Amino acid sequence: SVELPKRDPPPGVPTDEMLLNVDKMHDVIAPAKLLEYVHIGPLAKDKEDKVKKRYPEFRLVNTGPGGLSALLRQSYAGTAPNCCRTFQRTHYWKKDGKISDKYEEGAVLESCWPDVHDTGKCDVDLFDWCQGDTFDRNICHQWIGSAFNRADRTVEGQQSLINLYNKMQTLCSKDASVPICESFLHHLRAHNTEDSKEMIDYILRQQSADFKQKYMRCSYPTRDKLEESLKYAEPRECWDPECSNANVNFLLTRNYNNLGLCNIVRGSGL
Amino acid sequence: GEVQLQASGGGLVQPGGSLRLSCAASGIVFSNNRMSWYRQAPGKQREVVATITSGGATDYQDSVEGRFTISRDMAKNTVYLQMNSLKPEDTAVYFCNARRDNFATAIYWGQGTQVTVSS
Amino acid sequence: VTLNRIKIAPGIADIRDKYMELGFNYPEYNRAVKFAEESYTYYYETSPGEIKPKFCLIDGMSIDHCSSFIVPEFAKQYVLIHGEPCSSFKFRPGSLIYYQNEVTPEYIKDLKHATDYIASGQRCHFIKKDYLLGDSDSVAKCCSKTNTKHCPKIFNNNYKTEHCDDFMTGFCRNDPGNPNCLEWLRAKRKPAMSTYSDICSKHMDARYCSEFIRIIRPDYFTFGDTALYVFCNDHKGNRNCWCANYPKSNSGDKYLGPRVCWLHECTDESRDRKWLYYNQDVQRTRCKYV
Numbered sequence: 320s321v322e323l324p325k326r327d328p329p330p331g332v333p334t335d336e337m338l339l340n341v342d343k344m345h346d347v348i349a350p351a352k353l354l355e356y357v358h359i360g361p362l363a364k365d366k367e368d369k370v371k372k373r374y375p376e377f378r379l380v381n382t383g384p385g386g387l388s389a390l391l392r393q394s395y396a397g398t399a400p401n402c403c404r405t406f407q408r409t410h411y412w413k414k415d416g417k418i419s420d421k422y423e424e425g426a427v428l429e430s431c432w433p434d435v436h437d438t439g440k441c442d443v444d445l446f447d448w449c450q451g452d453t454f455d456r457n458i459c460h461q462w463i464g465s466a467f468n469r470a471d472r473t474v475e476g477q478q479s480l481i482n483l484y485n486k487m488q489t490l491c492s493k494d495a496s497v498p499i500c501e502s503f504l505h506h507l508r509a510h511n512t513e514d515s516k517e518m519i520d521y522i523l524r525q526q527s528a529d530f531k532q533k534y535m536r537c538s539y540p541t542r543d544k545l546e547e548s549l550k551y552a553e554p555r556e557c558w559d560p561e562c563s564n565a566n567v568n569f570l571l572t573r574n575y576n577n578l579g580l581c582n583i584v585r586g587s588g589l
Numbered sequence: 590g591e592v593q594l595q596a597s598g599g600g601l602v603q604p605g606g607s608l609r610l611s612c613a614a615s616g617i618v619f620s621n622n623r624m625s626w627y628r629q630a631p632g633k634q635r636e637v638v639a640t641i642t643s644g645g646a647t648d649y650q651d652s653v654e655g656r657f658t659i660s661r662d663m664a665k666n667t668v669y670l671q672m673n674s675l676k677p678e679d680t681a682v683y684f685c686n687a688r689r690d691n692f693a694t695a696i697y698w699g700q701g702t703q704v705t706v707s708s
Numbered sequence: 709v710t711l712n713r714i715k716i717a718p719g720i721a722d723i724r725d726k727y728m729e730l731g732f733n734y735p736e737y738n739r740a741v742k743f744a745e746e747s748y749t750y751y752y753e754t755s756p757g758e759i760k761p762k763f764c765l766i767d768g769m770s771i772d773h774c775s776s777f778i779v780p781e782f783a784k785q786y787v788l789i790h791g792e793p794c795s796s797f798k799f800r801p802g803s804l805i806y807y808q809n810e811v812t813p814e815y816i817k818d819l820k821h822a823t824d825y826i827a828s829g830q831r832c833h834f835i836k837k838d839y840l841l842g843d844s845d846s847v848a849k850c851c852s853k854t855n856t857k858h859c860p861k862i863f864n865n866n867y868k869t870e871h872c873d874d875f876m877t878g879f880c881r882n883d884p885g886n887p888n889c890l891e892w893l894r895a896k897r898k899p900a901m902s903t904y905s906d907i908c909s910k911h912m913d914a915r916y917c918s919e920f921i922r923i924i925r926p927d928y929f930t931f932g933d934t935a936l937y938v939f940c941n942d943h944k945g946n947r948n949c950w951c952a953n954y955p956k957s958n959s960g961d962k963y964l965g966p967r968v969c970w971l972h973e974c975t976d977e978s979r980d981r982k983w984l985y986y987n988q989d990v991q992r993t994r995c996k997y998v
Contacts, residue, residue, distance in 0.1 A: 323799040328769075332775055384788065406902035464933075508965075539651035550693065552643060
């Protein structure tokens with residue numbers, strides 16, 4: 320049998336890729352972004368369906384021989400009620416009809432868009448959730464405030480801003496005392512533009528006689544109050560107790576501006 | 590004498606129209622006085638409609654807020670009153686009023702101009 | 709077909725390239741096939757972004773036999789992709805058969821059908837990528853920056869990407885004064901600013917919350933406003949809250965908005981601006997003094 324020149328190959332030395340186990344990489348795969356390959360090591364053929372069900376947002380790619388595979392994110396399936404009412408959760412796990420922040424074997428990953436709070440993807444959900452008993456002061460104030468500085472800066476994120484402002488203008492004209500509307504009026508003031516000031520006066524002038532009699536007596540003084548204020552050189556807002564006791568969010572723009580014209584002596588001026 | 594607060598610009602216009610009243614002051618400097626537009630309905634007491642301080646801060650009567658606007662021209666020493674969306678209850682004689690900053694005795698009232706809106 | 713002569717003829721220059729002198733019963737089968745074996749221990753690239761050892765991974769051979777010829781420290785950032793088809797000897801596995809002037813691709817197919825002396829496979833091929841994390845602790849050490857030795861760029865880029873956001877929310881809640889946590893906060897992403905909004909609603913007095921207010925103003929000031937509101941409600945009598953939540957009135961709005969300048973305590977230039985709301989602090993700078 321012409322005794323062949325046999326020789327065995329050198330003993331194998333596995334790399335880090337070859338020692339990867341996908342069942343330990345839930346915290347590595349979840350933060351992965353689009354167009355990024357996350358190598359998971361050699362994957363047996365019978366475990367492919369187990370991996371593809373755990374990560375439906377990802378595409379399983381056979382990258383090399385011996386079953387070497389990687390995961391490539393294709394989409395974000397995060398729903399509005401699970402991604403929009405928080406700013407710290409980037410993903411969650413679904414198992415047996417329940418939603419959890421912690422991974423568990425047999426659960427399905429679902430991830431939120433990184434720009435979900437930089438665009439307008441949450442405006443519809445939070446417009447209803449920030450009304451009534453579901454109002455969360457922290458989340459809802461941060462949502463309204465973050466709109467005025469919409470990080471998208473895209474011609475679409477800028478238009479979703481105008482759509483939201485028209486909705487809040489219609490809602491808050493019916494009643495400006497609800498907490499989400501008082502927050503909207505406050506953030507319009509802080510924006511300090513000609514459009515935001517114009518929208519403030521529009522909303523406050525649309526209010527009922529009940530609202531104006533309750534919150535806007537600094538803007539609508541009585542006959543005797545207005546007549547007596549003509550006897551002083553300073554603006555009425557600088558001494559009127561109705562203006563010193565007023566909610567600044569319900570002041571007309573003129574009254575708000577006049578409040579800062581009161582010639583404060585060095586120290587405390589009143 | 591010779592403190593002159595003559596009001597003009599009135600007239601007749603259908604409800605919803607607009608008027609612009611004028612009051613070219615003489616003998617009075619605006620940087621010293623508070624200028625206030627009054628009005629007096631037939632058979633009723635006079636009431637202040639708008640006002641502007643010597644610094645330029647304005648204030649209005651509630652039933653005219655948003656519709657009327659009082660402004661100043663320091664060079665021309667003339668105060669103005671833009672009237673928009675005139676309602677039938679705005680029919681009155683509108684006249685000027687100058688009040689000194691810290692001299693209560695130096696108050697002067699001017700001759701009015703007729704404002705009438707109807708159909 | 710039957711083999712009757714076999715011998716190893718040494719190569720010309722490269723010790724890795726040898727010749728396999730074959731002798732059969734038909735001159736067509738009598739050939740001298742050149743073959744390569746081994747490829748040092750690579751700590752460098754053979755091509756830009758590639759490491760291709762002279763080794764033919766036969767179908768069925770263990771996958772780590774292909775990575776025997778790379779230094780383990782150097783191989784941490786390399787992945788094994790599919791390689792071009794090659795030929796090897798079954799009795800001498802791993803050898804890379806060359807397709808010489810006489811050694812044609814058809815010849816290899818003929819011997820494959822002839823005897824068991826030759827097997828088929830794919831060529832070793834490694835691509836440069838980055839470090840490959842496989843543990844939660846590995847993500848922790850990279851993101852917390854307690855150990856950044858073998859960390860990919862996505863988990864060690866000074867938080868310029870959002871890969872470490874999920875870990876840093878829990879990590880920085882436990883240690884808000886950590887210098888890396890403040891660096892993560894300076895990236896100004898929603899998870900970080902929300903995390904410190906919760907932190908400073910309880911620890912606004914701390915110095916790291918002064919930095920928190922500095923970082924988020926003025927682009928995202930609402931995260932500070934909500935924290936100051938919660939803090940000064942839970943600490944109504946604390947003197948630092950005198951201007952944000954006036955303790956002697958029902959609403960505590962005495963010095964909000966333009967009214968911030970009616971009391972010297974609120975305008976005192978030596979007080980930390982975290983004790984005023986954002987727009988309240990803005991109105992402080994626009995006040996007419998006589």
